[PDB]
């Protein structure tokens, strides 16, 4: 038996926390805190102060616009029957310009709408970025977040904007829809000769799987050393405690090496960021440099060979 530090068994309250004071040029902090005995069961129960400047608000708006352009379109495609729209919602979507257009700007109903939802979405995204950049300087902190976010954007941008443009065809972009964006994912791999054989696809998986291995590792570790107050990662990095010690040694003894309370967060930051970076690079080269990944892998002696237990005569070869 032993507390596992999963669920706070006894919580405590104090006047809500309005946060650190911001410097020169930061509007008040709207919203007034509230608590919730249940959020508290698993985390800080204070639900509080949000900051909203020009940027952030200018982001929700544009952001809702794009989401709006997407929906009406979905409503339009099912004939404007909100019963039918609700029934088939999963299969609905707003596709990108057809190939006939290359990069020409087509009429709204012929893709111009996609470009408008794309334009505004990116705009709202590139704005939340800035948002997260302001909020971190006003606090003297560093831009590790905005630089990680900037990493995810690069992949996003590569999917719907950079690759299409380099390829000179908006039709290569991703459609806005739940199941539709799933179908695009599968067809994309089919179109380019199996993405399993794309080396950067392999790297991005390793990094996606590893981000799960890592967080499970760091999270389980820090919890297992919580008894020694290992969660206070802030002072253990400045004033190493037996928590950072019991931790580093659990690993040294397990796998032959270890990190530090601080450095483990660098292994983590980097392992996440490289998931979206190797991804976009992966998509960047697709069709642009390589057209059939499986074949490329064959050219590089990477594809396994199996006893031919099944084969088919090629009719094209009369």
């Amino acid at each position: 038996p032993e507390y596992q530090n999963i669920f706070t068994a006894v919580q405590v309250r104090a006047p809500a926390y309005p946060g650190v004071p911001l410097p020169k040029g930061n509007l008040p902090r709207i919203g007034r805190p509230i608590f919730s005995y249940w959020l508290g069961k698993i985390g800080d129960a204070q639900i509080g102060p949000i900051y909203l400047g020009l940027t952030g608000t200018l982001s929700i708006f544009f952001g809702l616009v794009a989401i709006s352009i997407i929906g009406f379109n979905m409503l339009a495609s099912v004939h404007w029957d909100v019963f039918q729209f609700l029934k088939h919602f999963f299969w609905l979507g707003l596709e990108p310009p057809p190939p006939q257009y290359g990069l020409r700007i087509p009429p709204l109903s012929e893709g111009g709408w996609w470009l408008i939802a794309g334009l505004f979405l990116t705009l709202s995204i590139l704005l939340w970025w800035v948002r997260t950049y302001k909020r971190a300087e006003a606090l003297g902190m560093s831009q590790h977040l905005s630089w990680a976010f900037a990493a995810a954007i690069f992949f996003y941008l590569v999917l719907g904007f950079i690759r299409p443009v380099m390829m000179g065809s908006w039709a290569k972009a991703v459609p806005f829809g739940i199941f539709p964006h799933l179908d695009w994912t599968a067809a994309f791999s089919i179109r380019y000769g199996n993405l399993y054989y794309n080396p950067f696809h392999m790297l991005s998986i390793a990094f996606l799987y590893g981000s799960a291995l890592l967080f499970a590792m760091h999270g389980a570790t820090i919890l297992s050393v919580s008894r020694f107050g290992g969660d206070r990662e802030i002072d253990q990095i400045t004033h190493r405690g037996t928590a950072a010690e019991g931790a580093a040694l659990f690993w040294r003894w397990t796998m032959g090496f270890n990190a530090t309370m601080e450095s483990i967060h660098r292994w983590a930051w980097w392992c996440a960021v490289l998931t979206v970076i190797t991804a976009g690079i992966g998509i960047l080269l697709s069709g642009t440099v390589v057209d059939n990944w499986y074949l490329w892998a064959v050219k590089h002696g990477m594809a396994p060979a199996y006893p031919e237990v099944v084969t088919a005569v090629n009719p094209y070869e009369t």
Binding site: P98, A187, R191, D291, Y306, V310, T311
Partner: protein
Amino acid sequence: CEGPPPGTEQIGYRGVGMENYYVKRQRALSIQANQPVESLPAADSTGPKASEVYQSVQVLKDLSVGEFTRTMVAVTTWVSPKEGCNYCHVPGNWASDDIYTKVVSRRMFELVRAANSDWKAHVAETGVTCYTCHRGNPVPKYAWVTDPGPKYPSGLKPTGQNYGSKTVAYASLPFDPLTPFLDQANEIRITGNAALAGSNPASLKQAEWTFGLMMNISDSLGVGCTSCHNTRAFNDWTQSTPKRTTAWYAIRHVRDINQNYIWPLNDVLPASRKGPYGDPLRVSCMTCHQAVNKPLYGAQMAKDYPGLYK
């Protein structure tokens, strides 16, 4: 969603993942739902040829009267047992073609005859009969038509068929999974034969269409992509299964059925047999297979009626 243990079949090499799963329960019900109607006793095959005793016999010419009559008795139960002989005939005038159901039937004797004698690379020696698509119904349950679901298709569509003859009719149809590949004959292939790029124009849209078509085919045969492919290389014929070859000839066979057998009869069929776009109920893989890798589990009905061969 219940089960253990499922039915399973190994398709490819061990470890390659090419296998098939299915519910035994339902496989047995399906087997029970796809029973063939037993054959009719052989026919006294003596005497003059039908074309010698009758007046407007343009197909079942060289058949004996007996076999001819027999062929008529079988085709009835196969297509319209509730209506009987009178379904495709003008009472009192058996020879008249003054009723669309006779002009169509005549044409459907030629569709089957053709299937069984010229498309063996597909139908092998199992062949087809009226029952194959009809299942005792005047209107095949699984005939299809380009219908508008409650959602709007992509305005884009495979470029017609890459033709301009009798195609003005396809121009009035919006995009639909089958018509552009199993009716018209657009390119299904999109995978490139070269590793590097700069030489393959197939679009992602084209990729999706081929993916869509393929999902239809699989569902129509009640199988998965591994019944014919090795998904690590969809385009590779050497890594595929001999069913892929067969499905290839099937795609042409169905193109020949729809183009020179169903569409031409479009003028003599009533509106009830045409979709909202004026296209006629035509043929697809579902039509014959109805969710089984082989129609009626490959029962061999046709071999009993010589009147169904050229």
